Amino acid sequence: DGVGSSSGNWHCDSQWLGDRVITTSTRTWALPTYNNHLYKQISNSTSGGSSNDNAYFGYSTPWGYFDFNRFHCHFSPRDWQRLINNNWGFRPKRLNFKLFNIQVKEVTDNNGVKTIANNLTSTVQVFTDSDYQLPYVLGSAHEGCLPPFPADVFMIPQYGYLTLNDGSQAVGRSSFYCLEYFPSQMLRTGNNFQFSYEFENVPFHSSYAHSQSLDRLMNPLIDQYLYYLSKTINGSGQNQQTLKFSVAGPSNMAVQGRNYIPGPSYRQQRVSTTVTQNNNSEFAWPGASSWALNGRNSLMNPGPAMASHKEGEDRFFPLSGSLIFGKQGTGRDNVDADKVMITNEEEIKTTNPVATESYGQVATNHQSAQAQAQTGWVQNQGILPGMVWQDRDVYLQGPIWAKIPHTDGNFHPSPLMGGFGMKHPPPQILIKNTPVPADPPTAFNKDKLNSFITQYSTGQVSVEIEWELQKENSKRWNPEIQYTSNYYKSNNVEFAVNTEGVYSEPRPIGTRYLTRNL
Amino acid sequence: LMGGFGMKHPPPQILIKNTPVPADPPTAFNKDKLNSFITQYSTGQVSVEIEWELQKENSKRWNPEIQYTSNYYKSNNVEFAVNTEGVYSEPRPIGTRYLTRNL
Amino acid sequence: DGVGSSSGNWHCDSQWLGDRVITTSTRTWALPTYNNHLYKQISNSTSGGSSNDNAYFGYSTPWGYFDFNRFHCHFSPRDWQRLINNNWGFRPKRLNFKLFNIQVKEVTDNNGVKTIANNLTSTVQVFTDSDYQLPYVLGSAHEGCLPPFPADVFMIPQYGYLTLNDGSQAVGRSSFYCLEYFPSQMLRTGNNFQFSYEFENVPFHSSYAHSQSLDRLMNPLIDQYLYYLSKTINGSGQNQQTLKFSVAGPSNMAVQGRNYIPGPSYRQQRVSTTVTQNNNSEFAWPGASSWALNGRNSLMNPGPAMASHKEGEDRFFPLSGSLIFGKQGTGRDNVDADKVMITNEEEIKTTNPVATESYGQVATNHQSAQAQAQTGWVQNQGILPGMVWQDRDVYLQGPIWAKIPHTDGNFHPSPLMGGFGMKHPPPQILIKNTPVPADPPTAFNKDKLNSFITQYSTGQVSVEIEWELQKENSKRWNPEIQYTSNYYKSNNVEFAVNTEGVYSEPRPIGTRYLTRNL
Amino acid sequence: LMGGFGMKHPPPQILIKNTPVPADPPTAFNKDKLNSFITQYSTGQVSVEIEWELQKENSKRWNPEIQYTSNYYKSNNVEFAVNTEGVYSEPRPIGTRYLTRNL
Amino acid sequence: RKNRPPIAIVSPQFQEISLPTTSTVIDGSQSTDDDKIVQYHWEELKGPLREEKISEDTAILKLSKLVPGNYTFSLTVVDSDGATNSTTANLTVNK
Amino acid sequence: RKNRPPIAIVSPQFQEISLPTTSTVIDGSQSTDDDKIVQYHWEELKGPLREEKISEDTAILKLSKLVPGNYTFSLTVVDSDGATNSTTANLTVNK
């Protein structure tokens, strides 16, 4: 409770129990002073000018925030291997967030050399938005999460939010939120902040693959008692028209009746990682699958969970239908294809349509003696009764949850980027260095004080999520596919630091390894 | 699709009919159904009382919201009120979506 | 509770008790169908066009109302004599309003001869506005009260109300009140309506005159210990200036010091009942005392309670500062001076200034060796500390109460027309014949039904107010002035019917007869 | 006369002062009051919480009242909010007299 | 909307007064309109040459320092929608 | 208020295509503005005589039934406050 007594210990364990795992995780943060304690409106006009699609209007608060909404903030690579090689599913039950060992530093650059001193009497104020009265910028797949590796320090992101706009201009119903209008908690160097949160009843993540296709769900030895129209002409003549029905069975498995159909589709453009197999034109934006909202288009990216490619063509990926991660030390502007990690979603090709292929055929006319049986293509298909699909995979680097937008309705609110869609996700934890004025004038001045002491804050942060698990019980005989670290000599151990001490995640690890038949 | 609340069991249909009153049956029996009725109508009052639950607003929005106001500008007739002939007119369709709630 | 059993008896007594009087009063009413069951907006545009002062905008409802807000609705002339000759004050305590013996009649003029039948199954709906959510048109000194004489039938007035306007047009904040939006009470021919009401704690009416003037409040034998500046020059020369103070006493009662001063004034124009003593010009409106509100002028009529005339000049009355009543059978447009009853307010000349005279003098410069002592006239004088005044008299034909407008403040809220000013006066009792459609078409028609059965309603109404009394206890020796019916032969007994059976009140009877010294 | 609530005993004046800290008294006694102080200032937080009673509206007025709304029309800055420089501006004086109450 | 033009009503059509009392009044505030009158305009026609003319805009006309002669004033009222109505008022002052 | 004029950005400055694939695309939806662009206008300059001209208003330009020749298109964007910015786009189609 004092300056010279630590306000919390470093817990970073991960204890596996009978039916749950409690992944604790601690990090060191550094919170700068954002906006110089100011609230500023931000727009594409401020940012120099953007197109109609990228037009926006919002505010940038002087508040930081904590975002542990990536799977590696909690799971080590070995923990992820234990989770995905052994369980058919998992879901978070509760979290316990602690913010301790706070220490606010004051820096002075009066002589040209900065001198970071210690400000014991200065506070940092942190509050959690547990009523969801603020814009929820988590679940947008942003940066600034707790780093994957426990050893490195991270800088807390700035909290800004967007609102309604007509171009760069604010329509009358665009809200402005002051985050000082919330009851915060003012913490000195001897105080600490902690809160607990109980996750929703979200379904288990389908942490498995399917060992049975949706169209091959049947006995390959017995034939159906149903008939299908086999022939429509009994010959090659002119006026030879018949209706010959044959029983649909193992000989012709394609035509036989089925109770369920693959999930919904929304076609993407098939771009190949072998650049000589693509078109010579710039089809990046023009050839993309977008959805329009109030006039301005926006990329699907990634859209409904569809299989990335057919079997045998690993090169093809949907133009925007897959999550792309960056390798360690990868720039943020036009990097080569070998510097990113494009996640394949082929484990769900058993139930979901291929992202780069049309959902199927459909008859588009009434054939008669004069008009041939004309049939069209179904590029996008919404939900139909009897459709079964499977959601997008969660990855070690991918998001964990997202907030279901408060609307009068939704369908299957699992996030299109993967994860658990919650009406009430973990609350936004917002932290800000309390302003300290430098020297008020000796004579009263009505204007707000603009000269503050330049200072920052640092400390530790501990989040502990308890995940429920769905153990495997399958009568499969042969071994399953499991995630292994390949035993072959290499310069660096993967998922470990190299000679410079920079920790790199070398691939995106999914969850769908164990197989479960339909 | 027209708006409202879709119910499997909505408020029941209340069906009312003036019971027929024959005028004058013949003094000799006639098997045919009576076709001469007394011409009559009915009138009265009807009272319906619905109890609506409400979902109060609790938003941390700072600036004022858009709200439905009657515009303060002189006009021949008060809107949503009778004119000189006593005929009551609703001058516009009023929706419900005025308060703002973020997604 | 049935059609053939009366729903209430005729109580019209007036029983005098030890310290209160309970004046019961019953009448027969006739309620027509107003506006043909319609709500209509009314304006000076509707009424053909009015000036800027008389511009208005409002609505005329199909509702009648009961208005027992005149003193003769309860007090017979003999009861009034008992009250005013024997008491120094009175105030209402509680009322008990009953509405019974309702009978709705249906009239048919199909053949050119009307045939008023009896509609037993038709109702009349009456409600009392006991939360004061409606415009309060009572206390406006309107007509349609219960008649002074119990024997005659009266027609219930229409209820209309005015709201805000800019000319004839409705500004945005001008309210429209539907009186069907109130829970009413639907009464058939066998039902009855009654309610009770407890009056406020209003002060007693000063039902007395003052037997002592405000400036003659002193011992006429002893002289004051205070001095007054008697002389300012000791002679008639040029440079003869002094300050000679003499003791103010019985010899010069005008100049001696006084603790209290007459009440506020707002001068009126002195018009004489001897028309040869007036000006030859039309000074009725131009010479009047008005007050402006939002641009449009409105007559004072009657304004602050001021004495009507000095002693000895009974002819002069203030142009608008007195209540004028009409004799029996008097028109409503430019009647002669001998057909109206102008009420004198001279009983309060002891404390109040004369309505037709300025409040007094006031010094309007600094006199010096060069400037004479210049003094001006005080035509209107607001309230000052130490002012004592007396309110306007209540009359047998005058109003009883009024509603104090709901404002952030007021001063001495007694009605300027006389009576008791109440925040919560007796509620407006609103009655309406429920519409009965004639014949709806055999085929559905979305339009509102416009063909109704022409019908009216009639019945009895009983109001009983309990008045507290303030008995006289004075050590005055000689007899007081008391209201007497003059014993001299006349064609008709006053306050009684003549050969045609029309009851006439021959004069306005005040209350200030007994004397009470200051 | 400027508006508000006139009280005989209004909220008391809260008076705060940095206590003087002399810099260096002379090593030899000097009767004069110390004039050399350490130049110093103070800072901190201040919290005031007022509980206001309210008088709810109960009017039988039919048509809508005039109410304070933030106008829905695109503008460079949200009113009653900070602009690009972070300076918060109140763009108009907001009164209280919006609901109507008859006399 | 389809407003009727105003009506100008001067209370004293023939105002009579002698030389001792020059200060007289002509009342035009009784002029009616379907909505409201936005301007009352007083202008003289037969007024003999005097110290000053009259072009007052008060609804009620106040006169002063009259000289003997015959006066004729015309009151112009203005509807909210621009319609006007001018009526004349006469005043004869004696020697 | 003191709005900066828009900027028209055509993604393919030199569009190249052969005769078999005439249907090409020129992207002008990347054109930026301080507020928003209310109109994208496509007009051709060096277009050889063909079945039809081009004056489309779509942000992204879709072309069809091209004939061999050299094409030059100029994209005109319009700020909300009327400021305009025209940039040119080239397309050469082979035999």
UniProtKB/Swiss-Prot annotation, chains E, F:
Covered residues, full protein: 403 to 497 of 1049
Role description: Possible role in axon guidance through interaction with RTN4R. (Microbial infection) Acts as a receptor for adeno-associated virus and is involved in adeno-associated virus infection through endocytosis system.
Known tissue expression: Expressed in cortical neurons in the brain cortex (at protein level).
Subcellular compartments: Cytoplasmic granule membrane; Golgi apparatus membrane; Golgi apparatus, trans-Golgi network membrane; Cell membrane
Domain PKD stretches: 7-95
Subunit annotation: Interacts with RTN4R.
The protein's name in its UniProt record: Dyslexia-associated protein KIAA0319-like protein
Record note on modification: N-glycosylated.
Residues annotated as glycosylated: N70, N85
